[PDB]
Design an enzyme around this catalytic site. Sequence first.
Site, PDB file in Angstrom:
ATOM      1  N   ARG A 184     -22.831  18.302  -0.655  1.00 47.95           N
ATOM      2  CA  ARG A 184     -23.942  19.091  -1.183  1.00 47.95           C
ATOM      3  C   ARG A 184     -25.223  18.895  -0.369  1.00 47.95           C
ATOM      4  O   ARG A 184     -25.947  19.856  -0.097  1.00 47.95           O
ATOM      5  CB  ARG A 184     -24.156  18.751  -2.668  1.00 47.95           C
ATOM      6  CG  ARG A 184     -23.030  19.385  -3.499  1.00 47.95           C
ATOM      7  CD  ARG A 184     -22.605  18.652  -4.783  1.00 47.95           C
ATOM      8  NE  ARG A 184     -23.524  17.626  -5.281  1.00 47.95           N
ATOM      9  CZ  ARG A 184     -23.148  16.610  -6.058  1.00 47.95           C
ATOM     10  NH1 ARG A 184     -21.874  16.483  -6.408  1.00 47.95           N
ATOM     11  NH2 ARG A 184     -24.040  15.720  -6.487  1.00 47.95           N
ATOM     12  N   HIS A 217     -15.475  21.198  -7.253  1.00 43.77           N
ATOM     13  CA  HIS A 217     -14.240  20.616  -6.746  1.00 43.77           C
ATOM     14  C   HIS A 217     -13.194  21.683  -6.456  1.00 43.77           C
ATOM     15  O   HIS A 217     -12.517  21.632  -5.440  1.00 43.77           O
ATOM     16  CB  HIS A 217     -13.638  19.631  -7.760  1.00 43.77           C
ATOM     17  CG  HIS A 217     -14.503  18.444  -8.039  1.00 43.77           C
ATOM     18  ND1 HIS A 217     -14.809  18.029  -9.316  1.00 43.77           N
ATOM     19  CD2 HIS A 217     -15.087  17.553  -7.199  1.00 43.77           C
ATOM     20  CE1 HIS A 217     -15.575  16.953  -9.254  1.00 43.77           C
ATOM     21  NE2 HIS A 217     -15.756  16.642  -7.986  1.00 43.77           N
ATOM     22  N   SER A 249     -19.501  15.971 -11.834  1.00 38.14           N
ATOM     23  CA  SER A 249     -18.832  15.521 -13.054  1.00 38.14           C
ATOM     24  C   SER A 249     -19.792  14.751 -13.954  1.00 38.14           C
ATOM     25  O   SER A 249     -19.852  15.000 -15.157  1.00 38.14           O
ATOM     26  CB  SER A 249     -17.630  14.650 -12.709  1.00 38.14           C
ATOM     27  OG  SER A 249     -16.680  15.369 -11.924  1.00 38.14           O
ATOM     28  N   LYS A 252     -14.163   0.717 -14.141  1.00 42.62           N
ATOM     29  CA  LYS A 252     -14.766   1.804 -14.913  1.00 42.62           C
ATOM     30  C   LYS A 252     -13.699   2.801 -15.425  1.00 42.62           C
ATOM     31  O   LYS A 252     -13.118   3.554 -14.637  1.00 42.62           O
ATOM     32  CB  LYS A 252     -15.815   2.536 -14.069  1.00 42.62           C
TER      33      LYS A 252
END
Lengths: 157, 156, 155, 155, 157, 156
Positions: F90, F17, F126, F41
């Site tokens: 990615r 990040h 993460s 969440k």
Amino acid sequence: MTGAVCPGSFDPVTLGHLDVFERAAAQFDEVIVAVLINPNKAGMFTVDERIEMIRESTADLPNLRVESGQGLLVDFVRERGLNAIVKGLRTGTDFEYELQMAQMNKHIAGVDTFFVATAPAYSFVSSSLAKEVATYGGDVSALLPASVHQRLLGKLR
Amino acid sequence: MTGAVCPGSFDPVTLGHLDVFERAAAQFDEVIVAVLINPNKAGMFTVDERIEMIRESTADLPNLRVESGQGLLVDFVRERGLNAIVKGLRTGDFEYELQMAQMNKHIAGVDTFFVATAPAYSFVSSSLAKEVATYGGDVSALLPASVHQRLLGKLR
Amino acid sequence: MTGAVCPGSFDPVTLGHLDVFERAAAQFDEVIVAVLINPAGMFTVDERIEMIRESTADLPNLRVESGQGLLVDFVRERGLNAIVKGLRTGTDFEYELQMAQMNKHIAGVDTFFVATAPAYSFVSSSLAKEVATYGGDVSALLPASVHQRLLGKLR
Amino acid sequence: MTGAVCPGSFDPVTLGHLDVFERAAAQFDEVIVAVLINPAGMFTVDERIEMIRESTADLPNLRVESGQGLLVDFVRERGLNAIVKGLRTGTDFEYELQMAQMNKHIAGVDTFFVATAPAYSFVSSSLAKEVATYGGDVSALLPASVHQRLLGKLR
Amino acid sequence: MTGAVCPGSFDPVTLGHLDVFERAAAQFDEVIVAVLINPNKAGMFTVDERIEMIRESTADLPNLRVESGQGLLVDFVRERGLNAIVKGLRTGTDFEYELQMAQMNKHIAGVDTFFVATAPAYSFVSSSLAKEVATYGGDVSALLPASVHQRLLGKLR
Amino acid sequence: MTGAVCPGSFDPVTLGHLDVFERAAAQFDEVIVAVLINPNKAGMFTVDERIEMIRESTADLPNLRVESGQGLLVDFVRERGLNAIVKGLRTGDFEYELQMAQMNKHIAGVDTFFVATAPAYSFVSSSLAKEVATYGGDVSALLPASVHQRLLGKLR
Ligand SMILES: O=C(O)[C@@H](O)Cc1c[nH]c2ccccc12
Ligand SMILES: O=C(O)[C@@H](O)Cc1c[nH]c2ccccc12
Ligand SMILES: O=C(O)[C@H](O)Cc1c[nH]c2ccccc12
Ligand SMILES: O=C(O)[C@H](O)Cc1c[nH]c2ccccc12
């Protein structure tokens, strides 16, 4: 004579789906839209609502009809004397899980699957993303048939 | 009267191609296999030889016929009163093929239906079968019986 | 003294998995099938182990063990540093890729991927369970033993 | 008596290739690097072999040989039936997948794929040659030996 | 102050390219379209023709200019005091070879690459496919700017 | 005055990040990191903790600021007078992210620029860093120094 089944949960139907319906109806003598219902999870729209939204936006396709079902898609297909599925695809990734299911369906029931690339203009709408965007107030009126958009906003309000 | 065109160079036809032809013939009233003539790259078999190999392999498909063609595929399709293409796919190329399908839809209103190859024929291609056979590899399980016979003759 | 670990939940083991086991067993002196304990599945860990042992009786250099936590710890605690994993698609390659690079980074454990036999390209434990649940015939996709065991869990 | 073959043109060998060689050498008793003779490249087969031998001197169980024709014949003629190949992306997985399944079909030779080290994810022989040709610094992407040899071919 | 380079061979420029130019020009103070020429292979259009076709269809972008070059893109970028490239992308496959080049370019010269998804309507046009379709007579008038279409047909005739 | 928003949950921020933040801050006059608050969440760190970790990691980026947000991302972006998103990628997800980018462009005219992660941080996320750390794996080379300290405290 010839025929195909266009399956999905259609919760709600989008313009991407309608494009696929129209293309299947142009190439097969009959088309059945199979509204597949999970008896263990209600979606946003009931079965009758889903079917009504599809019928209203396919009124100009005389060789198309709409039916609900559950369980194995290949049983729905074979019970109607057919052995083809037509599904819309957006990406190479869509082609991989759908590939797995198409080969399984051919293996267990001899049912073929034909994939069609959806139109560029509808390539980024999905039922799920339209619902999520509409939930937080985004404008999705150009991605859904008139039979759907305000009924969707009503569900959300 | 429904119908579709199955296009390719088929140099030579493989069992992967045949599987697609059979599924198309089972779902459309008429199927035309369109064999490309390409003035630039002249491959291993002549167009006539390629058509003969396909006709041998599709002898049990009465609603399928084989013809040669040149130039823009959508012209070939529309000239025969059709507006559907059926093509076999192995991998996600769903990408170059997607580009082509959308282009063909845009310029001529011709639709394209893709079908996944049978798992058993998913790694065969005309080019790879020729390359393997050139060096004595055994690809007889991947080609129609008659093709395999003819292929061995071209290599001698 | 070469060796590799073949990890999974194997709920149940399929002929796709068995194909990978047989290939790993043919190329490494020692293979350990690592069965994850992760407790919402259909078979207990003991049943999954039993089914794999039943299906791998012709592979003398393969054993089956259960584990939890980081796979690299399971691998390293047994003196090995290679994982063998089966792959069906390019999509599988990308998320498995992330894991493989993470596992190499944290523990120096290498991951070797092998392509499924074409005939098992479309079988997975979850799709087999789903199809069988609704009455579809998956007998050609599972070891004979497993198939009978699955029928018993559904009926 | 385990073993694998690592194939390529290696024109020239890169640190990405060397990473794969080192991983293969760590997990198999015997590794053979198979250098294709395919005659339009930059280095002769002898030079390519030399550069690989120079860069793999710390790997006692690795040797380097040239070959032509079907890779599976090269592999089988040496009593082995495993290929180890490095992979960077899902796209590479799909065309290599076709080859792997073909090679298994015609000769029973298995193919194991390993992910590149992240640091060499973007290096290839062709891109290194191209960048160096126009003056870019690729010294961190090639074995020290190879790098000097490349400079000599361009100047 | 801020700036980006939009590279390509643009032989010819398409509406997909123009979309990317417009989006870069909206987000960076200056944009340079870099027409990259291979001195060892003539394309369909000469360098001057390529540049003229781009200028004519970007006349309403005051912060955009068009320059040709060859060799390493990162040298073209750095010589102009910039260190960003903006490129359009259609697919996940486009993301993989372009990924390789972006990481190489960052490695050798510290130049960043920003990718943007082209508009759905232009997602299937490429210079190469437009040329190939036009060669055999297909209608590509809606995929190319007015500055290009008839000049293309002229080249082909 | 150019500008872009870098959105995420950042639970916690990783070096992947941070690499994206640095490249965005180098190319736009202003960058806003938008930290999502999600009522459903609730992850490992509170929104305040996540903002603090990002501010520590971006202390040398004077034209970058960190703010929390909720609901539709394009509303967050337009409310701040901007119309660009910068996101790191990615793999080819270029696919779900592509869908989202085209949707965001369609509904609000907001553009999205994607940048490839540095090779060294291409496998960190993460979620995977938390999972590895939960079981005693060492992810200190993949996170900012301060994050690693805080993460070990949440696990105890
Ligand atoms: O899949 C393929 O390779 C086809 O597009 C070949 C093909 C392109 N254009 C044609 C015109 C007539 C007959 C075949 C063709
Ligand atoms: O990449 C992601 O996860 C973002 O889309 C999060 C995100 C979605 N909606 C938002 C509103 C305000 C701030 C952040 C968000
Ligand atoms: O491939 C999978 O499904 C997982 O890697 C299984 C797995 C994760 N951690 C483990 C520890 C011990 C044994 C198996 C595991
Ligand atoms: O990966 C590659 O580039 C090729 O597999 C190389 C190759 C093909 N055939 C061969 C025979 C002998 C030695 C190498 C080869």
